[PDB]
Amino acid sequence: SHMASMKKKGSVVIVGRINLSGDTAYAQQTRGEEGCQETSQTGRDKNQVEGEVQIVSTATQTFLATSINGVLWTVYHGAGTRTIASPKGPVTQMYTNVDKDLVGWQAPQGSRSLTPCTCGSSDLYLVTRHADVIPVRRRGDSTGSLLSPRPLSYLKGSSGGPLLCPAGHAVGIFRAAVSTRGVAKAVQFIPVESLETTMRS
C-alpha cells in the first residue's frame, strides 16, 4: 500500500543471437550479465542488433525472440507485459495475447525478419538457444514430433525460438514441450498463421 516505494519491472534485454547467416549455426553473446542488469533498469540498449533470432533475458529468465514480418515475437510466460530495451528507451509491446502465450514488439532496427511460410510442408526444423537445429515432423496445427527425442533440459530456454520449413521460412514459435518422464518427444508451437491473424486485426 506504499506506492512511493513500489518497484517497476525491468525491460526484456537482448543479450545475444543465434547466428544463421553462414553454413554453421552458433550462439553469440552480445551483452554480459552486469550490462544486462543495467540495461533492464534503464531500458536503454545501444547495442547494434543483428539477425532473426535473439537471445533475451529478464532479471529472472532467459529465452528466445524471433523476428517475423517486422515484429519481434516471444512468449508471454517469458516476457509478461514487459517493455523491451532499445536505443531510445523502453518499447511497449504492440501485441499481447495471454491466451496464445504470445507477445510482440516492433522489430529492432538492424534485425532481419523471417518470412511467413506458405509452403504447406510438414518437414520442420527447430532452432534452440544453443544453436542446435532439431528436425521436427509437423503433426498438427500446433505440434510436431522430434525425430530424436531429447531430455527437457536440452529445450529449456528455447521458447520464442523458430520452427522453420526447408526453405527457411517461419512456420511457428516454440511455446511448450510435450514431455513424459522428463523426455521431450514433441513440441507445441504458435503457428505463423496465428501470428498473421494477430497482426491482420
Residue 151: its H or E element = strand 143-151
State the Cα torsion 37-153-74-51 to the nearest 10°.
80
Catalytic-role residue among 11, 86, 111, 159: 159
Q: How far apart are CA 192 and CA 197, in angstroms?
A: 9
Active site residue 77: yes
Q: Stretches 30-38, 39-47, 85-93, 148-156: which one binds ligand O31 (CB under 6 A)? A: 148-156
Could you say which DSSP state residue 109 is in? T
| Partner whose binding site includes residue 119, from Zn ion, Cl ion, ligand O31, none (CB under 5 to 8 Å by kind) | Zn ion
- Which is closer to Zn ion, CB of 84 or CB of 165? 165
- Which is closer to ligand O31, CB of 49 or CB of 75? 75
Three cell numbers at 198?
Answer: 494477430
Rule CB under 5 A: say whether 115 interacts with Zn ion: no
Cell 521460412 found at = 169
Active site residue 101: yes
Strands 123-127 and 133-138: antiparallel
Interface characters, 28-47, with ligand O31 (x: CB under 6 A): --------------------
2 is in an annotated binding site: no
Point out the residues that are catalytic: 77, 101, 159
